[PDB]
C-alpha cells in the first residue's frame, strides 16, 4: 500500500538504516522478533485510544510530576501557611490580549480546582479548560495536586512564581492527530533426558591474518575450566578438534553461553578475535550441528584472552574471521525443560545469631565480595532468606549454576519470591544475573513499583542493560517499549538513547529492530523525530566541515563560513521549527544567527540560539540556547548529571537545601551531543579576567566576592551568599565522592544570584581546592564555615546511605563502552571514597580528614 511505503521511508530516515534491510535478514529470531513485538505496539495503541481524546492527550502530554505528593519540611515551610501564589493567564481577543489573574490557593489543589478558582476570580468584574505551562508545551492534564508537578515544586523551591495559561480543552484536542497505527506487511523433542558431557568440535577458521581458547560461562562466571585447542600454524587454520568440558549436558543453566577467541603466541599470548554463542536459541532449543560464527575485533584493555561480557551473535560484517563449529546432535531436537518439569525435579531434589548474620550480609554493598563459606551459608539458609528479600542478589550469587538441582530449586524460590524496591530490582539486571527467571522477577518488580518519573530517572541504565539480554524478544524490552509507546516523554529519550548507538554494529541489529517497532507504533511524533534527526544531520555536516576543511582558519573566517553555510535555505529549513532533543516540550523556531557562534575552546563547539515561539515565551524564556558538540564523548557527562540530579533529590527529600544544577545533556550519536545553556552563568576564570586589575596584571582570586556583591546589592547579598555556600558544599561532596577530573577556574561556573555548578566532566573515578575566592565568599574561623562543614558532613552521610543505588547504577552502565568505566575495579573507587567497609563514625572521621587536606 501507500501508507506502508511512506511509513517505511520515514522510519528508515529516522533509524538511519532502511527498513528493507531487516527483511533481507534470513534469521528466524529476527523475523520472529519483528512479528511478536507488534503485540506490545497493539497494547500501547489500544491504551492510547482506550478513553477517547483524553487518553491520547495524556499520552502526548503526560504530567511531569514527582513520585511522591508529600513535600519535605523545608519545602512546605516556603509556602504561605501551606498555600502557594499562582498566576493564571488567559488569551482573549483575536489580538491575543493576555490577561493575568493572581490566586493564592492550597498547594494540594487539583488543576480542576485551580481552573475553578481562576474562573471565579475572573468573573468578579464548567470543566472545559486545562492548564498549560507558560513558555513550553507542558500540560497539567491530570488530577494531581498542583505542588506535585515538577514545575510547581521547582517554582516553590526557587522562589519563582508559577505562571500558567488557561486553555480550552477542545483547542488542545483539535491539535491531536487521529493516529492510525497500521499493522506492517511482514506479519501476514527430548528434554534433559540426554545424559552426557558437553563437547564441541572446532572445525576451521577463515579470514585469519595460533590456537583457539574456549569456555562455558553463565554471565561472567565460568561453569567449568577453559579449554585450549591444539596450537596450529596460522597458515592452515584447521583444527577439527573436539573439546570436552567438565559439565553434564542437563546441568547447563538456561543462560549458558560459549565464549571463544583466537589467540597467538610469540610465551606472549594475545587475543585476536572473539565471539560468543547462546547454547540455547530463543525457542529454548539446544543448538546442534554446524554453525558459522564471524568474530569481533578485540576491545581496548582486555585483561583475559576471552570477552564473555561481550554481546552475543555473529558479526554483521561477514568479511571478518569466521570460525566453523559443530555441536553434538542426539536422538531428536533438544529443548530446555518446562517450568513444570523444573518444579517436579525441585520437589524431588537456624539460630538468632545466624539470622542477624544473614541480615548483616544483606546490608553489605554489591561490590563487596562474598566468601565461599558465606556462599554455602546463604545456600543452606535459602528458605529463611525469603523473609529478608533484599538479600536476593547475594543469594543468587551464592548459587552453583552448574547444577540443575540447585537451579531448579532457585527457580522455585523465585516463582514466589516477594517483590523488592526498584532501586534494588535493577541490581538483578546487570551482567551478573543473566538467568531468565531472575530477570523476569526484576522486570515484574519494575512494572509493579516503578513510577514513570523514576522510569525516566533511570531510563538510560535500563536501555543499557538491554544489551545484556540473551535474546531479542524478552520481558525487559517489552516493558520498556510499552512504556515508551504509552508515554511520549519516556519514548523521546528511549528513541534517542537507542539511535545514539546505532553506529555500534555490536547492537545495531537489536536497537535497529527495536527502533523499527517503536517508530511503527509511536504515532505522529515520528515526523518531529525526523525533523530533529535532519537538524542534527545538518549540524553534524557543518561541524564536520569546520573541523577539517576550514579547521586551521581564524575565528572570524570560520565564523564567516558558518554564517554562509547556516543560511542556504536547505539548511535553514532543517534547523528551524522543531522540538529540542534535550526537552521535546521546548519549541525551537527561527535561528537567531546573530546570536550563534563557534565556542572556540576545543573541537569547535557550536553555540546555537533559537527564539521561543511559545505564545507566552516571555514568561519562561524568549530565547533557548544549546551547545551542539561534535567531537568528544558525552555519555560520561550524561551519567554524571543524572547522578548529580539524584543526589540533589536525595538531599531535598532528606531536608538539606543544597541547590545543585543538573542541566540537560543528551548524546545523540557517536561523540555527537547537545548541552543545555544555563542563562546568566559565567566561569570563575571569566570573573577573574573581567575583574583583572588591568590588561597587563595578575588575576587575584579575592575579587569573586566583589563581583557577587556588585551583582547582588542590598538584602539580596545574604541570599546570594547562602546560595553560593550551599551549592558549593553540594558540589564539593559530589566531586569528592565521584572523583571528577581536574577542576580549575574555567570548569566551575556561577550565576548572577550566587549559584555554583560544574561543567565538562572529563574523567571520573581516577580535593575541591576551595580557592580562597570560595572561602572569602562563605565569609576560616567563622560560624559560616562551621555551618558549611556541617552541610558537607550531612551530605556525605546522606550519599553513603545510598552507596548501594549508586554502585548499582555504575555496574549497570558498565555495559556502555565508556573509557573511565571498563571494569568493577573502576567502580571500587566509590566503595573507597564512601568507606563502605568502615562504620558510620569511621567514614565521618575519614571525610573530615580528607577535607582538612
Ligand atoms: C582571561 C584572559 C583570556 O585569555 N581569555 C580568553 C578565554 C576566555 C574564557 O575563559 N572563555 C571563553 C571560557 C568560556 O566562556 N566558555 C564558554 C562556556 N563553556 C561551556 N562548556 C560546557 C561543556 C560541558 N560539558 C562538556 N563535556 N563540554 C562542554 C563544552 F565545553 F564543550 N558547557 C557549558 N554550559 C553549561 C552551563 O550553561 C551554559 C553552557 N559551557 C566553556 C568555555 C576569557 C578571556
UniProtKB/Swiss-Prot annotation:
Changing residue 372 to K: In MCAP, KERSEB, CRC, BC and HFMH; somatic mutation; shows an increase in lipid kinase activity; oncogenic in vivo; occurs in the interface between the PI3K helical domain and the nSH2 (N-terminal SH2) region of the p85 regulatory subunit and may reduce the inhibitory effect of p85; requires interaction with RAS to induce cellular transformation; enhances invadopodia-mediated extracellular matrix degradation and invasion in breast cancer cells; increased AKT and RPS6 phosphorylation in HFMH patient's cells. Changing residue 9 to P: In CLAPO and MADAC; uncertain significance; somatic mutation in CLAPO and MADAC patients. Signal peptide: none annotated. Pathway: Phospholipid metabolism; phosphatidylinositol phosphate biosynthesis. GO terms for biological process: actin cytoskeleton organization; adipose tissue development; angiogenesis; anoikis; autosome genomic imprinting; cardiac muscle cell contraction; cardiac muscle contraction; cell migration. InterPro entries: ARM-type_fold, C2_domain_sf, Kinase-like_dom_sf, PI3/4_kinase_cat_dom, PI3/4_kinase_cat_sf, PI3/4_kinase_CS, PI3K-type_C2_dom, PI3K_ABD. It comes from the Eukaryota. Its EC number is 2.7.1.137, 2.7.1.153, 2.7.11.1. Residues 81-168 form the PI3K-RBD domain. Residues 350-521 form the PIK helical domain. Coiled coil: none annotated. Changing residue 372 to A: In CWS5 and HCC; also found in a glioblastoma multiforme sample. Changing residue 369 to K: In CLOVE, KERSEB, CRC, BC, CLAPO, MADAC, CCM4 and HFMH; somatic mutation; also found in glioblastoma multiforme and endometrial carcinoma; somatic mutation; shows an increase in lipid kinase activity; oncogenic in vivo; occurs in the interface between the PI3K helical domain and the nSH2 (N-terminal SH2) region of the p85 regulatory subunit and may reduce the inhibitory effect of p85; requires interaction with RAS to induce cellular transformation; increased AKT and RPS6 phosphorylation in HFMH patient's cells. The record marks 603 as: Implicated in the recognition of ATP as well as PIP2. Also crucial for autophosphorylation of the p85alpha subunit. It holds the Pfam family PI3K_rbd. Residues 194-337 form the C2 PI3K-type domain. GO terms for molecular function: 1-phosphatidylinositol-3-kinase activity; 1-phosphatidylinositol-4,5-bisphosphate 3-kinase activity; 1-phosphatidylinositol-4-phosphate 3-kinase activity; ATP binding; insulin receptor substrate binding; protein kinase activator activity; protein serine kinase activity; protein serine/threonine kinase activity. Changing residue 6 to N: In MCAP; increased phosphatidylinositol 3-kinase signaling; decreased interaction with p85 regulatory subunit; no effect on protein abundance. It catalyses: a 1,2-diacyl-sn-glycero-3-phospho-(1D-myo-inositol-4,5-bisphosphate) + ATP = a 1,2-diacyl-sn-glycero-3-phospho-(1D-myo-inositol-3,4,5-trisphosphate) + ADP + H(+); a 1,2-diacyl-sn-glycero-3-phospho-(1D-myo-inositol) + ATP = a 1,2-diacyl-sn-glycero-3-phospho-(1D-myo-inositol-3-phosphate) + ADP + H(+); L-seryl-[protein] + ATP = O-phospho-L-seryl-[protein] + ADP + H(+); 1,2-dioctanoyl-sn-glycero-3-phospho-(1D-myo-inositol-4,5-bisphosphate) + ATP = 1,2-dioctanoyl-sn-glycero-3-phospho-(1D-myo-inositol-3,4,5-trisphosphate) + ADP + H(+). Changing residue 831 to Q: In CRC; uncertain significance. Phosphoinositide-3-kinase (PI3K) phosphorylates phosphatidylinositol (PI) and its phosphorylated derivatives at position 3 of the inositol ring to produce 3-phosphoinositides. Uses ATP and PtdIns(4,5)P2 (phosphatidylinositol 4,5-bisphosphate) to generate phosphatidylinositol 3,4,5-trisphosphate (PIP3). PIP3 plays a key role by recruiting PH domain-containing proteins to the membrane, including AKT1 and PDPK1, activating signaling cascades involved in cell growth, survival, proliferation, motility and morphology. Participates in cellular signaling in response to various growth factors. Heterodimer of a catalytic subunit PIK3CA and a p85 regulatory subunit (PIK3R1, PIK3R2 or PIK3R3). Interacts with IRS1 in nuclear extracts. Interacts with RUFY3. Interacts with RASD2. Interacts with APPL1. Interacts with HRAS and KRAS. Interaction with HRAS/KRAS is required for PI3K pathway signaling and cell proliferation stimulated by EGF and FGF2. Interacts with FAM83B; activates the PI3K/AKT signaling cascade. It is linked to PIK3CA mutations are involved in various type of cancer. Mutated isoforms participate in cellular transformation and tumorigenesis induced by oncogenic receptor tyrosine kinases (RTKs) and HRAS/KRAS. Interaction with HRAS/KRAS is required for Ras-driven tumor formation. Mutations increasing the lipid kinase activity are required for oncogenic signaling. The protein kinase activity may not be required for tumorigenesis. Belongs to the PI3/PI4-kinase family. The PI3K-ABD domain and the PI3K-RBD domain interact with the PI3K/PI4K kinase domain. The C2 PI3K-type domain may facilitate the recruitment to the plasma membrane. The inhibitory interactions with PIK3R1 are mediated by the PI3K-ABD domain and the C2 PI3K-type domain with the iSH2 (inter-SH2) region of PIK3R1, and the C2 PI3K-type domain, the PI3K helical domain, and the PI3K/PI4K kinase domain with the nSH2 (N-terminal SH2) region of PIK3R1. This is Phosphatidylinositol 4,5-bisphosphate 3-kinase catalytic subunit alpha isoform. The gene is PIK3CA.
Amino acid at each position: 500500500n501507500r501508507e506502508e511505503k511512506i511509513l517505511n521511508r520515514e522510519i528508515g530516515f529516522a533509524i538511519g538504516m532502511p527498513v528493507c534491510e531487516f527483511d533481507m535478514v534470513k534469521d528466524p529470531e529476527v523475523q520472529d522478533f519483528r512479528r511478536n513485538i507488534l503485540n506490545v505496539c497493539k497494547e500501547a495503541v489500544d491504551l492510547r485510544d482506550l478513553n477517547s481524546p483524553h487518553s491520547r492527550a495524556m499520552y502526548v502530554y503526560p504530567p511531569n510530576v514527582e513520585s511522591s505528593p508529600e513535600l519535605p519540611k523545608h519545602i512546605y515551610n516556603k509556602l504561605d501557611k501551606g498555600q502557594i501564589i499562582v498566576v493564571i493567564w488567559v488569551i482573549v481577543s483575536p489580538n491575543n490580549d493576555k490577561q493575568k489573574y493572581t490566586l493564592k490557593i492550597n498547594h494540594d489543589c487539583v488543576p480542576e480546582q485551580v481552573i475553578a478558582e481562576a474562573i471565579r476570580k475572573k468573573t468578579r468584574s464548567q470543566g472545559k479548560y486545562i492548564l498549560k505551562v507558560c513558555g513550553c508545551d507542558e500540560y497539567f492534564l491530570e488530577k494531581y495536586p498542583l505542588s506535585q508537578y515538577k514545575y510547581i515544586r521547582s517554582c516553590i523551591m526557587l522562589g519563582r512564581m508559577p505562571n500558567l495559561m488557561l486553555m480550552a480543552k477542545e483547542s488542545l484536542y483539535s491539535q491531536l492527530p487521529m493516529d492510525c497505527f497500521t499493522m506492517p506487511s511482514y506479519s501476514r523433542k527430548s528434554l534433559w533426558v540426554i545424559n552426557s558431557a558437553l563437547r564441541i568440535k572446532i572445525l576451521c577458521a577463515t579470514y585469519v591474518n595460533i590456537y583457539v581458547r574456549t569456555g562455558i560461562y553463565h554471565g561472567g562466571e565460568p561453569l567449568c575450566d577453559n579449554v585450549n585447542t591444539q596450537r596450529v600454524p596460522c597458515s592452515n587454520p584447521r583444527w577439527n578438534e573436539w573439546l570436552n568440558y567438565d559439565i553434564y549436558i542437563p546441568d547447563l543453566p538456561r543462560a549458558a553461553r560459549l565464549c571463544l577467541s583466537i589467540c597467538s603466541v610469540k610465551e606472549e599470548h594475545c587475543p585476536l578475535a572473539w565471539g560468543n554463542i547462546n547454547l540455547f536459541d530463543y525457542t529454548d532449543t539446544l543448538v546442534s550441528g554446524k554453525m558459522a560464527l564471524n568474530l569481533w575485533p578485540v576491545p581496548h584493555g582486555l585483561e583475559d584472552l576471552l570477552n564473555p561480557i561481550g554481546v552475543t551473535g555473529s558479526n554483521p560484517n561477514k568479511e571478518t574471521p569466521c570460525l566453523e563449529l559443530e555441536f553434538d546432535w542426539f536422538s531428536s531436537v533438544v529443548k530446555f525443560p518446562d517450568m513444570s518439569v523444573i518444579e517436579e525435579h525441585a520437589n524431588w531434589s537456624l539460630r538468632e545469631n545466624d539470622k542477624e548474620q544473614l541480615k548483616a550480609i544483606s546490608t553489605r554493598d554489591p561490590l563487596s565480595e562474598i566468601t565461599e563459606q558465606e556462599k554455602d551459608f546463604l545456600w543452606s539458609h535459602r528458605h529463611y532468606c525469603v523473609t529478608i528479600p533484599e538479600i536476593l542478589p547475594k543469594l543468587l550469587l551464592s548459587v552453583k549454576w552448574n547444577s540443575r538441582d540447585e537451579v531448579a530449586q532457585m527457580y522455585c524460590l523465585v516463582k514466589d519470591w516477594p517483590p523488592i524496591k526498584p532501586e534494588q530490582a535493577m541490581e538483578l539486571l546487570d551482567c551478573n544475573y543473566p538467568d531468565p527467571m531472575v530477570r523476569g522477577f526484576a522486570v515484574r518488580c519494575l512494572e509493579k513499583y516503578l513510577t514513570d518519573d523514576k522510569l525516566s530517572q533511570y531510563l538510560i541504565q535500563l536501555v543499557q542493560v538491554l544489551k545484556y539480554e540473551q535474546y531479542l524478544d524478552n520481558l525487559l524490552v517489552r516493558f520498556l517499549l510499552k512504556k515508551a509507546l504509552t508515554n511520549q516523554r519516556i519514548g523521546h529519550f528511549f528513541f534517542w538513547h537507542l539511535k545514539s548507538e546505532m553506529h555500534n554494529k555490536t547492537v545495531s541489529q537489536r536497537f535497529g529492530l527495536l527502533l523499527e517497532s517503536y517508530c511503527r507504533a509511536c504515532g505522529m511524533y515520528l515526523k518531529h523525530l525526523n525533523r530533529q534527526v535532519e537538524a542534527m544531520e545538518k549540524l553534524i555536516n557543518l561541524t564536520d566541515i569546520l573541523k577539517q576543511e576550514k579547521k586551521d582558519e581564524t575565528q572570524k573566517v570560520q565564523m564567516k563560513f558558518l554564517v554562509e553555510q547556516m543560511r542556504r535555505p536547505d539548511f535553514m529549513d532543517a534547523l528551524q521549527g522543531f522540538l529540542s532533543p534535550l526537552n521535546p516540550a521546548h519549541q525551537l523556531g527561527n535561528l537567531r544567527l546573530e546570536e550563534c557562534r563557534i565556542m572556540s575552546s576545543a573541537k569547535r563547539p557550536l553555540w546555537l540560539n533559537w527564539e521561543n515561539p511559545d505564545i507566552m515565551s516571555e514568561l519562561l524564556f524568549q530565547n533557548n540556547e544549546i551547545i551542539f558538540k561534535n567531537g568528544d564523548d558525552l555519555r560520561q557527562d550524561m551519567l554524571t548529571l543524572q547522578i548529580i540530579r539524584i543526589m540533589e533529590n536525595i538531599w531535598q527529600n532528606q531536608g538539606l537545601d543544597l541547590r545543585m544544577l543538573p542541566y540537560g545533556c543528551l548524546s545523540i550519536g557517536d561523540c555527537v551531543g547537545l548541552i543545555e545553556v544555563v542563562r546568566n552563568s559565567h566561569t570563575i576564570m571569566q570573573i577573574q579576567c573581567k575583574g583583572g586589575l588591568k590588561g597587563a596584571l595578575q588575576f587575584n582570586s579575592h575579587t569573586l566576592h566583589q563581583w557577587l556583591k556588585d551583582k547582588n546589592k542590598g538584602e539580596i547579598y545574604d541570599a546570594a551568599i547562602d546560595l553560593f555556600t550551599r551549592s558549593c558544599a553540594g558540589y564539593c561532596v559530589a566531586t569528592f565522592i565521584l572523583g571528577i577530573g581536574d577542576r580549575h577556574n574555567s570548569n566551575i561556573m556561577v550565576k548572577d544570584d550566587g549559584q555554583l555548578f560544574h561543567i565538562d566532566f572529563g574523567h571520573f573515578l581516577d580535593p575541591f581546592v576551595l580557592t580562597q575566592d570560595f572561602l572569602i565568599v562563605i565569609s576560616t574561623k567563622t560560624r559560616e564555615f562551621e555551618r558549611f562543614q556541617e552541610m558537607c558532613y550531612k551530605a556525605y552521610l546522606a550519599i553513603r546511605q545510598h552507596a548501594n543505588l549508586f554502585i548499582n547504577l555504575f555496574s549497570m552502565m558498565l555495559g556502555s563502552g565508556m573509557p573511565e568505566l571498563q571494569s568493577f575495579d573502576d567502580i571500587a573507587y566509590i566503595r573507597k571514597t564512601l568507606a563502605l567497609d568502615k562504620t558510620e563514625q569511621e567514614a565521618l572521621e575519614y571525610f573530615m580528614k580528607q577535607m582538612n587536606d
